[PDB]
């Protein structure tokens, strides 16, 4: 997205916010690189974030935002419906249901792929 290539990235904190380990040690006492929120800089092991290997690869190439920082990729807002924002299971971008193309009135069932990822 043109607006992801444009917001600067915060200084990463080299500690997992969930388990307090570093890149040297996750919850299984194995090394694992962190991913860091572009807006707040806080970090997590992909395994602590419960991300699949495939999702992990994709988010490391994007201006990834944590759960609380996530803004809608269409309207750039969080807003009153923030908590019901959908997260793409391919790239982890957020979309309000009403901001999807086409707009949705009910929550999708199962794994959900966003308008950017779907072919």
């Amino acid at each position: 997205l043109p607006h992801e290539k444009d917001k600067p990235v915060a200084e990463p904190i080299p500690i997992c916010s969930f388990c307090l380990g570093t890149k040297e040690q996750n919850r299984e006492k194995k090394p694992e690189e962190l991913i860091s929120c572009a807006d707040c800089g806080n970090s997590g092991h992909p395994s602590c974030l419960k991300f699949s290997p495939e999702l992990t690869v994709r988010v490391k190439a994007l201006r990834w935002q944590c759960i609380e920082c996530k803004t809608c990729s269409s309207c750039r807002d969080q807003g009153k419906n923030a908590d019901n924002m959908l997260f793409c299971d391919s790239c982890d971008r957020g979309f309000h249901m009403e901001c999807c193309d086409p707009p949705l009135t009910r929550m999708p069932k199962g794994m959900w792929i966003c308008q950017i990822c779907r072919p």
């Binding site: 388990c19 908590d83 019901n84 959900w112």
Partner: peptide
């Protein structure tokens, strides 16, 4: 689908913030 709300729950809680600051120092 995952939402912000359901992802918050399914991920599990963050560690106590005082413990994170203690490790950051």
């Amino acid at each position: 689908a995952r939402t912000k709300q359901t992802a918050r729950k399914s991920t599990g809680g963050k560690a106590p913030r005082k413990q994170l600051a203690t490790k950051a120092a």
